[model samples]
Target: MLPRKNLFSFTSKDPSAFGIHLAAAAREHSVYFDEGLGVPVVLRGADVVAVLRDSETFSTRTYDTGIMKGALVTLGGEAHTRMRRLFNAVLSPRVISRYEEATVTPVARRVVERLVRKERAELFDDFAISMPMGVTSALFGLPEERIAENDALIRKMIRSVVMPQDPVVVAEGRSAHAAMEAQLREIAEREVAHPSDTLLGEIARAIVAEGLGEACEGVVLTLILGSYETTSWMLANLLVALLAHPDAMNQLRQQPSLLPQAIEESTRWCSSAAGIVRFVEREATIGGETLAAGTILYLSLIARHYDEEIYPRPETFDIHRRPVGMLNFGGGLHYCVGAPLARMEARVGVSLLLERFPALRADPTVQPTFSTAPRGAAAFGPDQIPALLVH
Candidate 1:
């Protein structure tokens, strides 16, 4: 058994080291009880997949009730399938393509243009973080000026969602959540009254037509918040991965067509969302251990992503490798709906960066740091990615 302290407080300080340790422990003990959190930690890829796929026995409602209640991720059975369909309608390939051409491309171009003359800058702060939010606001028909406010509130709400046990964080999260929901509700109402071609308008029409008024706020907030943070972190980490691996960077520069491969590989190499939690609704047997009902399982995505059986040289950052089986966006009923938009934004973001700065490189003096907000191996992107544009 891994030490209780190791399971509870390992990732809080040094996540990379903790991940290595966890992987080693998983090799010996695939499943074990985490006394600190009083939940079971599933480390093996096969077992984790089993827990995620068996939603009938592992309920998401209990996981969703605290922060993401009423959102698609928390819904189960027919309700989950129905909500997913509605999201797909709004995020259709056709719609995402239009947004990419009209909003994402233009935004990336403008953001890069502003950075071309700079010798050095923090990519996370100056570009990666802002670009995704800009595209999201454009898609939702929200004004650019509100991006800062929206980002702050979303961070608070997300922190609360991940660590709901903290009283102070929960309180702060509720305040932020209420404010953001109110803003989204106001936007939904306006869109309903004056529908347009924007994504928000399409969702508003769907909400009214489907008689989902009660869920309007949750749905709208989910779309906006969901599209912003994870994508931003993914963009930042993708850049970091590319800069760290010169061969891959050179490949992308030589063949821009490989941007999709690079993006997918980056997602696999450095997944934005670290892990997901599930509530065991029925007594179950996993990894030769019987777990009773009401058990919480922390599915270690990082462990699975780095599983040697799944990917040879899993720690290596190589864009050319096949990524058909990656689980960065998750799987099954709760797979991320904003996946297309995230990919589009990353593709455009990386393309623009490469086009503008062919000689871009990481700043050696300023080391990047991983986020420690959510804890338990769900670390997001580097808090700051300092880079230089070498002419």
Candidate 2:
């Protein structure tokens, strides 16, 4: 059993320790508080998947509860399927493809154009945050200035979820939640008065039709909070990998076919959003162990991403690795709805980066640190990342 002390850390003072703790938990049925949140983590892959797939035996309803529940991830059963289906049309692969060429690519290029000329530009702010923030905002049809405020609030919400009990963290999260609610309600009212084809309009219409206005507000808030932070983390990690591995970057630049593979590789390498937790509904057996009802199974996706069984030499960042059950986007019913959008963003974003900066290198003076807060992993922050674009 992994020591409880090993599994959780308060500050970012011990990233390696956190990694080792997760790795150890992955190898056995050990319980850990998992970052001082008092949540029990079940790290073994087989156990994690079994529980994730068997929603009847393991419920996600607790995940949908309000902020006070601290397990707002639950929304299982009919509610989960219905809510997911409502957004399915908007989040579909076809819709994602349309945005890739039309909206996302243009927004990313615009950001690049603005920041590319700087002697030392921070990738986190200039590229990662800018691209996702702008694209998501555009998709929702929110004003650019409002989108900036939303971005800040969502980031704070992430901090709250990762460390829920902290007074300051909780306070920040509440404030953000209230602001988001007000903004979303205002959008809903406007859309009802004059509906548009924007994603937010569609969601507002669905909320009224299905009597999911309350749920819609909650879901949209969750989506905004969860989506960009994880994507930002992945982008930062991928940029770092490209900077370190010139051969990989050269291969990608020379062959456009490899862009998708590179995106998959980076996702596998970074494993954004460390884990997910689910509450068991019935007594069940997973990985040869019988777990009773009401048991909380925390699935460590980060550990599984690095598991040798799934990917040989999982430690290495290789684009050629066969992409099979990579949990970066998750699996089963709760699979991320924004998956296609994320993939497209990565593909276009990286493709443009390679095209513009053939020889990009990270500035040694700005050695950024990694984040262990769920989707905030491999984050370089706004200060540390400084890169040169070798045209």
Candidate 3:
């Protein structure tokens, strides 16, 4: 293992530097590199899978912690499995398909309708974020008005949780959590009294029926937070890539059949979730290095996506590149359960936007904001992307 003093820091202030630094360290370190924002983390993709699949050894319980450790994702073993089961039931293929035409189709249309009204509109907010926020809100059985109300808090919590040490991020995160908790409680209670056809109502009813009330709040929060934010960011980044690589963009435009491939390539090239953390439960040899028990490892998805072993000319935005499994949605048992829903949403959202506005391009004057390392995040709102469709 690398020394603790040189461990990688996964903060937002300097994400690009953090990524570049780790790629360099990864070149020399064995399986684990300890660069102490926290500990020497293991970075190998295969090692990441080993840790993820064997939840008992690595543990998924930590994902449930809120500020420090209450989030449902942190829960492990039987508890983690149970909590996830409740969510998977409501989000399964049966439930998703039932609501597809009703929720997905309308939301997709609304997103296109709103974006097409503008001569120039930022794709992220107008199209990408709009789609999921609406669909997820409906999924959770929250009022349509609640989407905007919750969006700020959701964004704040996401930003803070990703980097809690920062005061601004922490403060915003705390407030956001408080707001969401309050909202979730109200919704949960309301659902209990008066059920609806939405996923949240279904989960709420199941909680009482299955006697799993403890998961009510955590799962609700997870459903809301996890469903849309990363998808929105990916949509933004994908738009940027499409704009930058006109040849790829034209290919997608000319052949609608390639949209699926394009989405996969964009996700791989511009990964939204940078890395995930796992605590080493047992001393294991990875990449020729030994990681002691209880060590925290930050597995870099961005780094893995760019890993030369997996992807050739990894930096280039080549839609034609053979689609390899990328870490954008995560892997192993904890792979995002909502992957299918998010993918479908993105496909519909992109299709709607492209069909409505064929002449979309990035505004040259406005520079795009890049996300920090490990997690490569980027955002472009209305002012940044003024789109114009050919009349």
Clashes of each: 1, 9, 30
Over 1-391, each residue of candidate 1 has an lDDT whose tens digit, in order, gives 3333245344322224545566777888878877655677877878888888888998785656556666788888888787788888878898888888878888888788888788998888778877976777777777788888887888888778767679899889889989877777777778655876777777877776666764666766787667666777788778878877888888888899999988887777777766778888888888877778887777777677777778877777778885766667777778888888888888888898888898899788876655534322245656677888986
TM-score of each: 0.90, 0.82, 0.80
* Cα lDDT tens digits for candidate 2, 247-295: 7877776787887877777666665556777777787666545567887
- Candidate 2 lDDT at 322 equals 48
Q: Write the per-residue lDDT of candidate 3 for residues 1-391, one digit (tens) a residue.
A: 3544454333432214334455565666535545443555656566666666777667653344445466557776676677777777877787777677768878888778865556677666577667778887777766777777877778787777767558878788888888878777787788756877777777777777557757566677777667766677677666766776778878888898788788888777666666677777787766666767866666666666656677767667788885777877787767888787777777777877776677877566555445443223332111233344455
Judging by lDDT against the true structure, name the best candidate: 1
> Considering lDDT, which of the candidate structures 1 and 2 is the better prediction for this target?
1
Q: What would you estimate as the lDDT of candidate 3?
A: 0.67
Clashing pairs in model 2?
60-74, 60-75, 61-74, 62-74, 63-72, 63-73, 63-74, 64-73, 64-74
- Superposed Cα deviation of residue 384, candidate 3 (Å): 6.0
Give the total clashing residue pairs for model 3: 30
Candidate 2: count of backbone clashes, pairs at least 3 residues apart or interchain: 9
CA lDDT of 313 in candidate 3? 70
